[PDB]
Amino acid sequence: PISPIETVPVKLKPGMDGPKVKQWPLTEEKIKALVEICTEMEKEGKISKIGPENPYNTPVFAIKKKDSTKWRKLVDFRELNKRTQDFWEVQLGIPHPAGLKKKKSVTVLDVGDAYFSVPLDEDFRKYTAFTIPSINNETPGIRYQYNVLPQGWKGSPAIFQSSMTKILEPFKKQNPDIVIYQYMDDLYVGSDLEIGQHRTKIEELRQHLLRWGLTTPDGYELHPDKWTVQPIVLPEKDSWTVNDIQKLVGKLNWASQIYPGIKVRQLCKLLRGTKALTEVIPLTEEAELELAENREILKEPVHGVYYDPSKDLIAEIQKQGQGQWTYQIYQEPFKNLKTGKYARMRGAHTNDVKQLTEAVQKITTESIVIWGKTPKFKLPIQKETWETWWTEYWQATWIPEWEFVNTPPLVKLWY
Amino acid sequence: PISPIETVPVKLKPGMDGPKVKQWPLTEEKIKALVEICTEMEKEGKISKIGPENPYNTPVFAIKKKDSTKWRKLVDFRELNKRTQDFWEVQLGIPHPAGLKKKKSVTVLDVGDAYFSVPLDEDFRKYTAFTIPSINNETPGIRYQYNVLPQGWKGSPAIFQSSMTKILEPFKKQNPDIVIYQYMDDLYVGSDLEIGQHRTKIEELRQHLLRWGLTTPDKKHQKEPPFLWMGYELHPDKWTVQPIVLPEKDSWTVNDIQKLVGKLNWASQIYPGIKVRQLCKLLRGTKALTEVIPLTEEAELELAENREILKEPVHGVYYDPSKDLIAEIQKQGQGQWTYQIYQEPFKNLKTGKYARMRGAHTNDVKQLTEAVQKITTESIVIWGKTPKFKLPIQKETWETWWTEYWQATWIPEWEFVNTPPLVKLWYQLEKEPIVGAETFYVDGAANRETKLGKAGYVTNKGRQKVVPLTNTTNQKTQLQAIYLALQDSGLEVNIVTDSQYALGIIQAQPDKSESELVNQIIEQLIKKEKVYLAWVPAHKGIGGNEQVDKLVSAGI
Numbered sequence: 015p016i017s018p019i020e021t022v023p024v025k026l027k028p029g030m031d032g033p034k035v036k037q038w039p040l041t042e043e044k045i046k047a048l049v050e051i052c053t054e055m056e057k058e059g060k061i062s063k064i065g066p067e068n069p070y071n072t073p074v075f076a077i078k079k080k081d082s083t084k085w086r087k088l089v090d091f092r093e094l095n096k097r098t099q100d101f102w103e104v105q106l107g108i109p110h111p112a113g114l115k116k117k118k119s120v121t122v123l124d125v126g127d128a129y130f131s132v133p134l135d136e137d138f139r140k141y142t143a144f145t146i147p148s149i150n151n152e153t154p155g156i157r158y159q160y161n162v163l164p165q166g167w168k169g170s171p172a173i174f175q176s177s178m179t180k181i182l183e184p185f186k187k188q189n190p191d192i193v194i195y196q197y198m199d200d201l202y203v204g205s206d207l208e209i210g211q212h213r214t215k216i217e218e219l220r221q222h223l224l225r226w227g228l229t230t231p232d233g234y235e236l237h238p239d240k241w242t243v244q245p246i247v248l249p250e251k252d253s254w255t256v257n258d259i260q261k262l263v264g265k266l267n268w269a270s271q272i273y274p275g276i277k278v279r280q281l282c283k284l285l286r287g288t289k290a291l292t293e294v295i296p297l298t299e300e301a302e303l304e305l306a307e308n309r310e311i312l313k314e315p316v317h318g319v320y321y322d323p324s325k326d327l328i329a330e331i332q333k334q335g336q337g338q339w340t341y342q343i344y345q346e347p348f349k350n351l352k353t354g355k356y357a358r359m360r361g362a363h364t365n366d367v368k369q370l371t372e373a374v375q376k377i378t379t380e381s382i383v384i385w386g387k388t389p390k391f392k393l394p395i396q397k398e399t400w401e402t403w404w405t406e407y408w409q410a411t412w413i414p415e416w417e418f419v420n421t422p423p424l425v426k427l428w429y
Numbered sequence: 430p431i432s433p434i435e436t437v438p439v440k441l442k443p444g445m446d447g448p449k450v451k452q453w454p455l456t457e458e459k460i461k462a463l464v465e466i467c468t469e470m471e472k473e474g475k476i477s478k479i480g481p482e483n484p485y486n487t488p489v490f491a492i493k494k495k496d497s498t499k500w501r502k503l504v505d506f507r508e509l510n511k512r513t514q515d516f517w518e519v520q521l522g523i524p525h526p527a528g529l530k531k532k533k534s535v536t537v538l539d540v541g542d543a544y545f546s547v548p549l550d551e552d553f554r555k556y557t558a559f560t561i562p563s564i565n566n567e568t569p570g571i572r573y574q575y576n577v578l579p580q581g582w583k584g585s586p587a588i589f590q591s592s593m594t595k596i597l598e599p600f601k602k603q604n605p606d607i608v609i610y611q612y613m614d615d616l617y618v619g620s621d622l623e624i625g626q627h628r629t630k631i632e633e634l635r636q637h638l639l640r641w642g643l644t645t646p647d648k649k650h651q652k653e654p655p656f657l658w659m660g661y662e663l664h665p666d667k668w669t670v671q672p673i674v675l676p677e678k679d680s681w682t683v684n685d686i687q688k689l690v691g692k693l694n695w696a697s698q699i700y701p702g703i704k705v706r707q708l709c710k711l712l713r714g715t716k717a718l719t720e721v722i723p724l725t726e727e728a729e730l731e732l733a734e735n736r737e738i739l740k741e742p743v744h745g746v747y748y749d750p751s752k753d754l755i756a757e758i759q760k761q762g763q764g765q766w767t768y769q770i771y772q773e774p775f776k777n778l779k780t781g782k783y784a785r786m787r788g789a790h791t792n793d794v795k796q797l798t799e800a801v802q803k804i805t806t807e808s809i810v811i812w813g814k815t816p817k818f819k820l821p822i823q824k825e826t827w828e829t830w831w832t833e834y835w836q837a838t839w840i841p842e843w844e845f846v847n848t849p850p851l852v853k854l855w856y857q858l859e860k861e862p863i864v865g866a867e868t869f870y871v872d873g874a875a876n877r878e879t880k881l882g883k884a885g886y887v888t889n890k891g892r893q894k895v896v897p898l899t900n901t902t903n904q905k906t907q908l909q910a911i912y913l914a915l916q917d918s919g920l921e922v923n924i925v926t927d928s929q930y931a932l933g934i935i936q937a938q939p940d941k942s943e944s945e946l947v948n949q950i951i952e953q954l955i956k957k958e959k960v961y962l963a964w965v966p967a968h969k970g971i972g973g974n975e976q977v978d979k980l981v982s983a984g985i
């Protein structure tokens with residue numbers, strides 16, 4: 015039972031065809047979950063069985079969101095989203111609030127059920143095909159395509175925009191000091207109110223959404239105050255060797271790509287000669303001052319950096335040991351928009367991959383909150399390792415773009 | 430009989446027309462038999478004689494001259510296939526015997542009129558036109574077109590599978606305890622029923638299919654002894670793949686070779702090491718299914734190695750969902766690994782070997798990791814879960830490796846199995862510079878234009894060396910410099926480069942490389958008792974680096 019109301023015509027970008035992306039292998043519980051989910055969605059007409067003469071495909075799998083509840087379905091539409099025409103003013107939805115990042119707390123509501131009530135353009139359904147795999151390939155895949163706005167597709171939030179506005183109009187009248195931002199399947203709600211005061215208004219908003227057909231899985235507190243940058247620091251030893259000094263100059267040099275005002279000269283001075291590494295050197299005064307100099311220059315945030323809404327956001331991550339990580343986000347090399355740290359361990363995960371999959375979600379969320387786009391990730395890990403394992407720890411309804419890197423000695427430079 | 434089932438709509442790729450390939454003539458003994466086989470086919474609906482208005486053609490052939498193999502026609506759809514639309518292959522991979530569960534009663538039904546009794550999309554038939562060669566020229570040959578899924582046409586398997594699923598669906602609902610698996614023309618049906626009732630549920634299935642157009646002969650015949658599903662022997666408590674026999678001969682046709690690759694792909698699922706690269710070479714570039722393509726030296730060698738492998742049988746046990754999967758790995762001599770997956774000691778489900786390499790520089794501990802990852806993924810495919818691992822690596826070895834690796838790594842639940850050659854890190858880089866070890870500042874340079882270079886060092890103790898080099902690169906000279914210092918020093922040494930390139934490679938503790946240079950560096954690194962490697966910016970003061978630069982760069 016869906017709404018006979020007109021569909022918006024949807025096209026792919028000129029020259030581009032649909033996704034033909036292979037399904038990766040799934041575990042049994044994930045399969046049984048999805049077969050269950052889909053069987054139900056098909057009875058309700060949300061999706062329809064199709065055959066092999068439809069050439070397109072998008073991978074699907076399953077997750078457990080807020081507090082390990084029960085199975086949610088997640089289609090990886092990254093490929094379709096890239097291939098899917100843009101929406102101009104309804105660009106990726108709406109404008110992005112600059113004031114969301116300034117609230118005491120922000121909660122993240124899963125509003126994806128809403129989409130399943132708008133029919134999807136008929137000539138476009140075919141590009142939404144996905145195939146549930148079978149164990150040992152006994153069965154062959156169950157193939158389906160969508161009849162309604164799918165979760166995860168960038169088209170969905172943009173086509174449902176005008177409905178969303180109307181649905182949230184009431185609640186914004188009664189609360190003008192609340193900021194609300196929609197990113198894909200998600201709703202970001204931020205007040206500077208007070209943990210209990212605030213949280214009641216989430217359940218309050220949830221109830222309002224619930225009375226509107228928008229079922230909402232049963233938040234997730236995050237505080238864009240508690241967000242600061244990782245300052246670069248130098249050591250300040252009592253005894254400086256040739257090696258010590260040598261490392262230091264190395265750091266200072268790399269760091270001369272970010273701050274063009276630092277000098278290293280007075281320190282190379284000290285190294286004049288073919289000395290043994292162990293040899294303790296006493297610092298000049300004209301050199302030992304140079305240190306506190308740069309130490310100050312590096313003590314004040316980089317200046318003049320410029321978010322550009324047109325360029326990608328890029329994210330680098332560095333494994334620092336100790337269950338601790340570092341990341342920089344930026345659009346152009348050395349002009350960083352943010353830098354931070356993500357420390358963990360001492361709790362429940364001696365798992366290196368789980369820790370990185372979690373860091374990627376914190377960075378993506380931060381980036382949504384601040385700029386309303388997800389960064390493309392440079393991930394310090396082998397493709398096969400990450401591919402065999404990431405989904406086991408994924409809890410977001412979105413998926414950022416990523417690639418796999420080859421880290422050098424710029425690790426011991428971010429701490 | 431042709432099935433009542435709805436056809437699946439079929440399209441040519443956009444912008445492409447239908448085939449228009451012309452018939453070769455020949456022996457008017459091939460024309461007989463063809464015409465016989467054809468009239469027979471036409472009698473049963475599979476094909477229709479058509480009208481010359483139809484512009485399309487694809488070639489026909491006659492094969493297996495007697496040989497206790499009467500005749501048989503042979504349509505070459507290669508040209509049509511390239512013109513027909515792509516299809517989504519639903520299956521992630523082909524089913525493995527070890528993935529099967531134990532069942533009290535099992536039947537395998539054969540689908541003979543498999544393809545030749547599933548309707549083709551009416552609109553698409555015109556593109557499957559072929560002619561039987563016109564002896565003499567006062568009129569053309571006999572024209573025909575298919576009404577069902579043609580043998581070698583690109584869509585038949587996908588559509589056939591699709592169709593079998595719609596057809597079986599009713600019978601499955603009515604019968605949820607019974608499991609059915611379709612694979613090509615094999616239909617596996619298993620249950621835990623008594624042989625009396627089970628055999629009875631089968632007769633019902635045979636009728637069900639019969640209503641939908643599909644035959645299924647009184648099976649018996651004279652093949653009943655062993656019991657075969659897609660080439661596997663399914664016994665009550667275990668499965669077996671009997672040794673496969675590859676034809677021997679010298680005259681090999683395109684068709685002969687197309688057949689061979691298929692039978693090798695089926696096989697690589699069960700056996701490790703099966704190669705097809707050389708054989709596939711022999712194919713593309715040509716035409717004429719029946720032209721003899723003589724085997725290259727390499728191809729001949731691939732086939733020899735393939736027989737040697739397929740020489741022995743394979744045996745395994747069935748899967749029991751109530752027991753953990755265990756997987757055990759052994760190192761097998763330079764990039765060679767073996768594994769066994771089992772649930773109960775000595776009753777193997779699946780055994781294999783991984784022989785590969787990471788990139789250009791690798792180590793046993795990386796390889797083992799990737800092997801664990803390859804196995805994890807196989808397991809999820811075949812059984813939908815991951816094995817508990819038994820690895821020939823000490824917990825402390827892995828502990829120190831993953832602790833210090835700049836990349837995230839992980840290995841699932843595992844325990845140490847003290848077995849063959851244990852997996853070791855062969856040498857370690859020191860964390861801190863070494864007291865009273867001599868300090869070599871190495872450097873290297875090479876004229877990109879001329880290829881001539883110099884590699885050498887300089888040490889705190891006044892030691893020095895510069896070496897003239899022909900046809901190398903900035904990057905090789907850097908590596909040669911480091912090697913110099915390893916060669917010319919004692920058991921303890923502090924090296925210092927400005928080479929990002931070089932330092933990275935050594936950082937990852939490779940114990941193996943495809944670079945001769947790098948392998949010599951390794952053998953040096955393993956002799957040493959203490960090595961400490963260090964990076965510095967090039968072209969700075971840095972008293973050490975400055976000098977080695979001057980000397981090593983008289984190549985401008």
Ligand SMILES: C=Cc1cc(N(C)C)nc(S(C)(=O)=O)n1
Nearest residue numbers: 613658659660661673691692695
């Ligand atoms: C060529 C594929 C193939 C297919 C097959 N099946 C699927 C019955 N059996 C064999 S065999 C007799 O060589 O074990 N081969």
